[model samples]
Target chain A: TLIVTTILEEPYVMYRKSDKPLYGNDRFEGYCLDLLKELSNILGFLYDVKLVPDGKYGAQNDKGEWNGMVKELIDHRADLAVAPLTITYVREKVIDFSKPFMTLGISILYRKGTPIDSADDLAKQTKIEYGAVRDGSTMTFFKKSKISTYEKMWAFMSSSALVKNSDEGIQRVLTTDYALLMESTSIEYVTQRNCNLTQIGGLIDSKGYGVGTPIGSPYRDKITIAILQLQEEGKLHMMKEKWW
Target chain B: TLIVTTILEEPYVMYRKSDKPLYGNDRFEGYCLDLLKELSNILGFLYDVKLVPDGKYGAQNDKGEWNGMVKELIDHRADLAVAPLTITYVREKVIDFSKPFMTLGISILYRKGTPIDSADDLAKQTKIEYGAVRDGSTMTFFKKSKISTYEKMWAFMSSRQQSALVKNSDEGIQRVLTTDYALLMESTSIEYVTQRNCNLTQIGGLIDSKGYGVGTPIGSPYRDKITIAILQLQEEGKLHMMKEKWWRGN
Candidate 1:
């Protein structure tokens, strides 16, 4: 069985509730779980799912070392990294990613009563705070942005207001006068369940979530073909509808 | 220098109008030309662009032989296919494609004053005939589709309306304007047509999603670099800017 490394993100990967002790794959259920099942059925591979030890999506440090599932893939400790991992240029260098199963962009999640509409509005004033998940793809986007508004926003975020993860980011948005810069897919899920919160303006940047495999892995191309098949058959959209 | 294969299509590859004589690369200019310039600049490679001899995109024949630019890539006559070549499963099996530089889907191009809005509407009734570019990706999509609406539409097209399939997009567009016909083609091309021709409009949302990708021969080293560069261009908004520059009237 291929060892799969993933993270616990609501609706993507989560611990299932049970009165009795659950073990192995039955211990979890969500979008990624369903996706893994589909992939295994198509590719005919058994998988052993394990959560990333560091609980990080993956990020590079100043010393050029990596952490989270990325490290697992780079070390070949994990055969697959199937989670809400964003496919970025940096990550692509260290690991191979299947063509995006889901496409999204960076957007703001704010309370419904706010007058804020665009990223420019948030960057212009200091009345409300904005930030992203620490060491996540959203944070990396702001850090690397050359755009003036994004640069200013990143300056503010870098100095203050970085959350541990999406859950904490969402909680901060609820408790304070703050907006969360996050993936549009997650924002859609959050706003659907929480009527008081809504997405602000349009997407700031576009990207996609892809399954990661170690560089030069034989499964990469086969996984890509399977993904394209799922996309053409509309199963990807159907899975999203099932989860969200 | 790399040998690049392409096709002549409106706003993608077109002969530049000059009173004086032109030669080689100078003879052509369009969106693909601009794209080639960008790719060459990023990758630092010289190229000799040649139009496909048969003027065909590509399709497999019954003999299991390929033709057009695809054959060129397979035969290693060209190092790159820098055209609006679609990235599809069958094509992918033989060649490699970079991540899509441009995303589009199959849709209808129809003249106004018709009640058609979706593929189903055209599939259900025969009053207005509909078809796709013969031997192109659009036709292949219908031919291989399993969805009921598309299969039924394909049955109608393959049996009775075989003549509806035109030789090229221009022929299909001409047929749409002069006859009671709806041309099924890529949404991107449809958008370009509707922009220039006020009488025509896209009927509905895309029926399926696909992308136009740069093609390389199987296991080519340039594929990865090309994919990364395309992603970079996308992030920098160069792809969107280039589309606007070519598709819209300046």
Candidate 2:
């Protein structure tokens, strides 16, 4: 059985509720779970799913230390990781990603009553603070903007509002004069649950999330083939429709 | 021979000076002129360059009247329309564009002495007035972002600040250098201007990204060959060399 490492992200991989004690794969149920079942059936391989130990999608810190599931894959501790991991050029150098299963963009999340309708409007307001997760793709976005002007904007934000994760950022936006800059897919999911919150502006940048594997791993080709097959057979789209 | 229509945009396509009378393509010189010369030479075809009658690149008005070079191509009045004509969704429905010859984004243009370093600085301040082309893609960007927020911006620009609604980006850029104004324009053009004028500079953070394409009437027979030729030139580094030749040399 292949040891596949994943993370606890909304609507992709989640803990299933049960009255009885669940074991192994039984504890997990969501899009990735269903996807793994289909892929295993097609590839004729037995597999076991485990959540990423550090519970991070992965990013590099200031010290250039790789963390989260990406670290696991790089260390050869996991064979495959299927979740909402964005495929970036920098990440592609260190890890391999299968054909992107879903494409998403970055957007702003704010309370419906907030007068800010776009990033431009947010720039005008000095009182309202905005933030993104530390060391995640969103922060990477701010730092990567042309000539570091986006980093300038990010630096201008109230440092106290910078949260450790999206959940904390979202929670902060709910009660304070704040905006959460995050992936549009997660914003879509969160706004559906919270009646007062909404996404503003068009995309800042568009990217895709793909299944990750160690760079130059043999399974990269196999998983990429499986992903392409699933996508062509409409299973991937169906899974997205059901979950997202 | 292909009937190529273009607009007079600085550094991309512009009028050339002569001591005596000049005629035909000799009267024009710029980046696209050099590009067209290379394309014509490689593709084994002849082209005639003519300026668009309305002096506009192209856009659909509120009444759905397509004007400038786009209408000329849509009505088959011209075979090819070059210049820094942006590829947009609405135009795609009516016309076809060759693979993007150039990639650009909407950017802010300001005088060298201005305090603004980015679009955010402009958004925050009310003292410096900014303007965009009256009916061009850069204006469309503000009108299209976040429903009416950009339209509200336009409304504020016109009502509160009386920002000059210039007819072209060249005029807008000129206005910025001479007055307390800023011009929101395509980065490609800004690049040329900033290269030539030391007193002018483009601010940080592009507002939106887009591409400039060689537009033809829908289903033009030459698109594939033209696109391939463009790709070849790009791969050979000819296109990059041409920009340096025409833009920086000026």
Candidate 3:
């Protein structure tokens, strides 16, 4: 319900009653103030600052919705959310986001020398016909990996006999073939020719991963102002380093 | 490599083309009879019929297309495929079939209204599952049934998966609750239900199990004869009585 909330990082958004005076210098201290400033400069907005920290278990789901912090906040179930949010499909689905405050790629997270080219490739070779598909899994993949091939499957009277389900469907081709694909983060691996895993390509797509709002209301500038403040001065680097 | 074939029913395509008389009665008649008899039936298909009645080179990979059947002649490599080949998608994929000389459903030879209603109910109930009548035959019914619960679980999981029960992680240390399912329809009760246990339904859905051309090979009269012979005797009660003789174990 309460999606995700981005709170103070450290050294920048310090508490007034903190134990240390120069805690602002502490890299991992309260740093949301610095991040808030950078956000403001980028999107040109303003906001009133408040200090409320140390609420770890205040509201986190069993599965923990961490990435769509701002979008969830605008949805009203969560009052206010402030955390590093990425505007990706997974996050965007629940609500809407703004111009990216920051961005990075989620890639294949496999081990070294594994035979994989890219996320798309892992999705492909896993489906195409090759007698190699152990069960109907590859045939099933041919469907989910695209829309047209899926429709072609039921064209015959053998609908009950054909393969479906991509999770297990990829097995048809994967069981025999040497290739596997995934986003860089999931199947991440270090490259070593015979290591059996590899990543191929240069940026699948690029866009601003940002704080989002619901359909349409307000609070657009508040988030933008917070981000711009951090980037303007030299404080943005430290915040990015700690989190990214 | 020979595929095991059994004569469960009649009106199968016999090889005696010139002698339709001998081919009509159980004294070994028609296209179905000719398939089981005749030297030309052997001569024309001798090169292929050397293997088995179904013509499938069981252990050999390239013997021929795997789905098995008997023809009027030894088309490729089977002593002969005497029984009527039932039409189904799985068998039709790799191999071609002959014209339907006889149509018969593989009925479940069972004591009516036993534990389950249809194959759906037989295969659906989680607590009770049936067993294979034999090492291979009775399990075939499960394959034909459209009811499927587990996806790949069928790979090594057979009716055994449905019939047997185990609660403990170690089957060695545990006891199984086996009073579950039944699969009865079989030609020789000894091969299926009776052979397994007294808990079999015997034969149901036989008439729906229509037979068809078990012939393959792109261009061959054997395919045509296969179809013609099955239809010839099917008009009368000859096809209907096949099970009373075969399923009853009489």
Per-candidate interface DockQ score: 0.08, 0.04, 0.01
lDDT of 3 at B21: 50
Which stretches of model 2 miss by more than 4 angstroms?
Answer: A1-244, B61-65, B112-115, B147-152, B164-171
lDDT of 1 at A207: 61
- lDDT assessment of candidate 1: 0.86
Specify the highest-TM-score model's number: 1
Of 1 and 2, which scores higher on TM-score?
1
Tens digit per residue, CA lDDT, model 3, B109-200:
32322333233334445554334433343344444433242222232235455434222212301121133333333333322233334333
For model 1, the stretches where C-alpha displacement exceeds 4 angstroms are A9-11, A14-19, A54-56, A59-68, A104-207, A233-244, B108-136, B139-184, B197-205
Worst 10 residues of 2 chain B by lDDT: B113-122
- lDDT for position A87 in model 1: 84
lDDT rank, highest first? 1, 2, 3
lDDT of 2 by residue, A134-173 (tens): 8888778777676344656676653565789888998898
Best by DockQ: 1
- Candidate 1 residue-wise lDDT, B100-210, digit = tens: 887777888887645454576789888888899997778987997877888999998887548768899889989988999999988788879977897787764456677
Over the stretch A1-244, how does candidate 3's per-residue lDDT look in tens digits? 1122444533323345646563332323333445545545554455443222343312335695543344345445453344444444444435545434443332322323233323333344434322212233333444443444333432321322333432332343235433332222222212322233333321222223355565343554345444434333324444644532
A225 in model 3: Cα distance from truth in Å? Answer: 68
Which candidate tops lDDT? 1
Query: What's the lDDT of the predicted structure labeled candidate 3?
Result: 0.37
Worst 10-residue lDDT window for candidate 1 chain A reads: A112-121
Candidate lDDT (C-alpha), each: 0.86, 0.75, 0.37
- What does candidate 3 score on TM? 0.30
